[PDB]
């Protein structure tokens, strides 16, 4: 099939800024009839995609002139001359020239804001969960920016990823930050076998990891 590659995956912008999203196809998008069916869609949260530009440069009805499309053959570009609040969402290019029509992976237009270190909280397993034979240690990493963060769990100085569930929130419409939850689930047996549980976060805001630890012996 024709692979549509979009770059970047996430694009941080400030309102008023100009923005460009690239879409490249693995093969020519020119159809046998001579036309290029390269379209661009914008999808906002909880909404269906909406057409913005069709056949490379034609703006669809009701789309503001701030949106422009260009390119040829295998390289296309979506340009937003001035980003408004209502432009935030995921942009997708699409080629409908060859069967099967394919979509690019999407480009998230996000709000750029100052770097913020995560506020990390760690929670020991509740007494109620232990009763059912389970043990989940929870780590919340809240209000940080940018979204790129690596969290590692260490049990008595040794890394463990098995049994870990990670989830990220979308950008907060209030402070434009991101938040993350990381849950390490072990059997009650395993949990009472170790003493130190560490949630370790690597974020560009610090040269050393942000560490929050819970030592059972200190309870």
């Amino acid at each position: 099939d024709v692979l549509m590659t979009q770059t970047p995956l996430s694009l941080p912008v400030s309102l008023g800024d100009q923005a460009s999203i690239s879409c490249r196809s693995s093969q020519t998008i020119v159809h046998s009839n001579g036309d290029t069916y390269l379209d661009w869609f914008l999808q906002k949260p909880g909404q269906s995609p909406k057409l913005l530009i069709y056949k490379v440069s034609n703006r669809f009805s009701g789309v503001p002139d701030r949106f422009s499309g260009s390119g040829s053959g295998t390289d296309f570009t979506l340009k937003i001359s001035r980003v408004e609040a209502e432009d935030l969402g995921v942009y997708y290019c699409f080629q409908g020239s060859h069967v099967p029509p394919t979509f690019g992976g999407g480009t998230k237009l996000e709000i750029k804001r100052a770097d913020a270190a995560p506020t990390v909280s760690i929670f020991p397993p509740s007494s109620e969960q232990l009763t059912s034979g389970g043990a989940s240690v929870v780590c919340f990493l809240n209000n940080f920016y940018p979204k790129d963060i690596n969290v590692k769990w260490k049990i008595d100085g040794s890394e463990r990823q098995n049994g870990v569930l990670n989830s990220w929130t979308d950008q907060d419409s209030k402070d434009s930050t991101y938040s993350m939850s990381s849950t390490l689930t072990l059997t009650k047996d395993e949990y009472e076998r170790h003493n130190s549980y560490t949630c370790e976060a690597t974020h560009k805001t610090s040269t050393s990891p942000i560490v929050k630890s819970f030592n059972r012996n200190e309870c």
């Binding site: 009839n33 269906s48 979509f103 992976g105 909280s121 929670f123 020991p124 929870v138 200190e218 309870c219």
Partner: protein, 222 residues
């Protein structure tokens, strides 16, 4: 009145079948090609099928021999009959009008429906276990508390704090599928001067199982 409305989505076990419908209004349905497009949980968009105004049919290779598209031009309804469903067929299915008629030099998706959710899973409805998350009390101006909503199915679950009276400083994380069951967590941050003094409770609702749990977050040593 140009609108597309999909229906028929829901839960089905792998190998099962389901029929989606897409009702069209506001335009002469018969003069346009129509298409079904799906969006995976990972948000990847994938074209499934296109049926032209003249009836020419084009399928994504992976659904060929499993899906059957059809249209009723009298009732302005587009159907998608899915059979031999796989886990990877789990997605939000959108019908879309294609601005094309047989022989036209233009074609593009100009109108989309709201979508209908399809979930292919062997899992059965399972109420959640709700656990309070409180800091070790022996361990700042603000305190973060939370609730862990573990091992439920299917989506969704709703989480509020103090029956909604506590809306600021709350983060509810998207559910993550683990071993066929979903787990979700929620955190709430409040001034240290209010907790434990004031009570904080998380309310969890899971409609699928009529579950409504209120879990008070009480201080405790670990």
């Amino acid at each position: 009145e140009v609108k597309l409305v999909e229906s028929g989505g829901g839960l089905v076990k792998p190998g099962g079948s389901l029929k989606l419908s897409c009702a069209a209004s506001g335009f002469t349905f018969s003069n346009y090609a129509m298409s079904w497009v799906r969006q995976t949980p990972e948000k990847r968009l994938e074209w499934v099928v296109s049926i032209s105004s003249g009836g020419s049919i084009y399928y994504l290779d992976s659904v060929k021999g499993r899906f059957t598209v059809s249209r009723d031009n009298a009732r302005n309804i587009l159907y998608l009959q899915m059979t031999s469903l796989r886990s990877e067929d789990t997605a939000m299915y959108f019908c879309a009008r294609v601005s094309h008629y047989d022989g036209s030099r233009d074609w593009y998706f100009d109108v989309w429906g709201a979508g209908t959710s399809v979930t292919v899973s062997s899992a059965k409805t399972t109420p959640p276990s709700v656990y309070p998350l409180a800091p070790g009390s022996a361990a700042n101006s603000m305190v973060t508390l939370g609730c862990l909503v573990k091992g439920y199915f299917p989506e969704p679950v709703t989480v509020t704090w103090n029956s909604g009276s506590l809306s600021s400083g709350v983060h509810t994380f998207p559910a993550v599928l683990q071993s066929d069951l979903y787990t979700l967590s929620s955190s709430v941050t409040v001034p240290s001067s209010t907790w434990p003094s004031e009570t904080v409770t998380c309310n969890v609702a899971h409609p699928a199982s009529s579950t409504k749990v209120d879990k008070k977050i009480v201080p405790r040593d670990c």
